[PDB]
Design a protein around this ligand. Structure first.
Ligand SMILES: N#Cc1cc(-c2ccc3c(c2)Oc2ccccc2C=C3C(=O)NCCN2CCOCC2)ccc1O
Ligand SMILES: N#Cc1cc(-c2ccc3c(c2)Oc2ccccc2C=C3C(=O)NCCN2CCOCC2)ccc1O
Ligand SMILES: *[C@@H]1O[C@H](CO)[C@@H](O)[C@H](O)[C@H]1NC(C)=O
Ligand SMILES: *[C@@H]1O[C@H](CO)[C@@H](O)[C@H](O)[C@H]1NC(C)=O
Ligand SMILES: [Ca+2]
Lengths: 442, 83
């Protein structure tokens, strides 16, 4: 009873679908009557929201948002919010130390629920943010039986990057460990988000370095000079995005964002990783396919700056044919996609090298659901004031076909020029291609 | 019942498809027809293949008439002007 638990500093609130922002009702370890007082549903599943580091000692804005979304998606479940705000309000390496103690508090609470009520641990889902992802990992590594799932939302990097599996979140901590890495910018062990994979599935939205809508782009950054600093770091925008990406997945059960297994972010940004064969793709978030692999699998995707975050990924392959040998560096282009449903015109992209009789693959992504692709317009951009003139000599290539592979629908589409060849000439009119083949990759 | 379809890429109006491929089970015959003005004046083209998901449509993308047709008979996907 209660006597064997008073050393537990952590508090456990059973938040409700109608009372999301406040810790009204508490589940007191060793006091079985408190479980009935809070109206825990012994029939339903349990989510344990474990916060991270705080300089204020108050729950952040995301806590009611996450609780509210779990109750929208799972209205009969139990959403427990873990309070470790005192310990999470110390100097960072000290709070990092307390993840061992919080991990222990949580495990003892979980083990109590099982001993006292014979509640199944296979019905437990741990969601940990920042240091809380490691507190969740330690908790999972100390329960009598394995918990069903652990979601790591941008797990803390400093003092964890080089920590061994028992001191941080690792795949042995639960039956399934999924991890979103959203702010990994910086040197290894010096990033705010952990860089190394720590789950069965490790998703790196937009490469995981920083999030769209969160950073100050390099151009703005150079112009601002000595004034501006790392606002993203301070404001915690990219870091917190993992919570919003997860929330999005709970509110859009029918249309999840897909992640793609890949060797590197650089390879992904060339459009080389867009397959769904042998679990090479998965759904970001709640609706994840619980595929536990032999090796840690790193997965990539692009997203929008705001909710709903889903974008459509396309790999575009072009063979730049020509009569005379020419090589152009850092060339800017615009691609326009015309489908059955909608269209997205003037999508920019650049190529580091454009050379005669060579093929180049690149990623094109768009918020627009264009439907089934019909037409493709390609523009080779010039910034010269004379590009309009027919007197102005500009380089050009003869392009016959454009091969496109759509990631979401897993379809290979060939587009071919209306005439024998489409002339793509720098600064001139766009080259037009119309669909001439389809292929479902399945 | 397994289908044989005509499989040709962006052929000009006055040219008939020679190529024929045996479709995978569940697949249908399709014809895409583009018709609009180009640098070499007005042009009509036709492409034909075995498709999985077949949706008949008629849209005028960037001033070019695109028509998609489906049929379940063997070697049926022949453009209107060639049937
Ligand atoms: N959410 C989140 C989150 C936050 C951090 C973080 C907070 C503070 C960090 C820090 C990291 O870097 C490290 C890393 C290793 C060692 C020390 C150190 C120092 C400070 C430091 O003094 N920050 C300035 C403010 N401090 C407040 C308390 O009073 C002293 C000053 C890391 C991961 C996260 O998920
Ligand atoms: N010494 C000292 C010292 C440290 C701080 C301090 C302020 C803010 C801190 C903070 C430290 O921790 C760190 C530490 C490292 C990285 C991030 C971080 C985030 C925030 C944070 O709350 N950010 C979110 C801000 N809000 C965004 C949403 O809207 C409301 C505002 C203050 C006084 C001091 O003397
Ligand atoms: C508990 O959850 C089930 C759904 O699995 C629901 O039908 C039932 O009404 C709930 N009971 C209580 C006491 O909330
Ligand atoms: C590119 O290939 C074509 C034949 O496909 C050829 O006519 C042309 O000369 C080649 N270009 C160069 C620069 O060799
Ligand atoms: Ca561990």
């Amino acid at each position: 009873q209660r006597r064997d638990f008073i050393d537990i500093e952590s508090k456990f609130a059973l938040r409700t679908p109608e009372d999301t922002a406040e810790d009204t009702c508490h589940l007191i370890p060793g006091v079985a009557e408190s479980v009935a007082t809070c109206h825990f549903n012994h029939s339903s599943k349990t989510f344990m929201v474990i916060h991270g580091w705080t300089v204020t000692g108050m729950y952040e804005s995301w806590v009611p948002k996450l609780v509210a979304a779990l109750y929208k998606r799972e209205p009969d479940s139990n959403v427990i919010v873990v309070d470790w705000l005192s310990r999470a309000q110390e100097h960072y390496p000290v709070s990092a130390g307390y993840t061992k103690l919080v991990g222990q508090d949580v495990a003892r609470f979980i083990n109590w629920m099982e001993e006292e009520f014979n509640y199944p641990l296979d019905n437990v889902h741990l969601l940990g943010y920042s240091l809380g992802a490691h507190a969740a990992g330690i908790a999972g590594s100390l329960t009598n039986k394995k918990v069903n799932r652990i979601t790591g939302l941008d797990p803390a990097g400093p003092n964890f990057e080089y920590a061994e599996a028992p001191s941080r979140l690792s795949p042995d901590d639960a039956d399934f460990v999924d991890v979103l890495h959203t702010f990994t910018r910086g040197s290894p062990g010096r990033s705010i988000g952990i860089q190394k994979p720590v789950g069965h599935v490790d998703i790196y939205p937009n490469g995981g370095t920083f999030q769209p809508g969160c950073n100050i782009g390099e151009a703005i950054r150079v112009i601002a000079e000595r004034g501006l600093g790392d606002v993203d770091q301070l404001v915690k925008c990219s870091h917190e995005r993992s919570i919003h990406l997860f929330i999005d997945s709970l509110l859009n059960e029918e249309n999840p964002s897909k992640a793609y297994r890949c060797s590197s972010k650089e390879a992904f940004e060339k459009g080389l990783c867009l397959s769904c064969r042998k679990n090479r793709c998965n759904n970001l978030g709640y609706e994840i396919n619980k595929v536990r692999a032999k090796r840690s699998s790193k997965m990539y995707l692009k997203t929008r700056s705001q909710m709903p975050y889903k974008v459509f990924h396309y790999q575009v392959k072009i063979h730049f044919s020509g009569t005379e040998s020419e090589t152009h560096t850092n060339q800017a282009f615009e691609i326009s996609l015309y489908g059955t449903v909608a269209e997205s015109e003037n999508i920019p992209f650049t190529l580091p090298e454009v050379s005669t009789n060579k093929t180049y693959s690149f990623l094109i992504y768009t918020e627009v659901d264009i439907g089934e692709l019909l037409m493709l317009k390609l523009k080779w951009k010039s910034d010269s004031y004379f590009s309009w003139s027919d007197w102005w000599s500009s380089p050009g290539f003869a392009i016959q076909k454009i091969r496109v592979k759509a990631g979401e629908t897993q379809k290979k589409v060939i587009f071919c020029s209306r005439e024998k060849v489409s002339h793509l000439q720098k600064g001139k009119a766009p080259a037009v291609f119309v669909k001439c083949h389809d292929k479902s990759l399945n | 019942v397994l289908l044989r379809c005509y499989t040709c890429k962006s052929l000009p109006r006055d040219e008939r498809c020679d190529l024929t491929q045996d479709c995978s089970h569940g697949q249908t015959c399709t014809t895409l027809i583009a018709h609009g003005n180009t640098e070499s004046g007005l042009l009509t083209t036709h492409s034909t293949w075995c498709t999985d998901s077949c949706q008949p449509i008629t849209k005028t993308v960037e001033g070019t008439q695109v028509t998609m047709t489906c049929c379940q008979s063997s070697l049926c996907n022949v453009p209107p002007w060639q049937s």
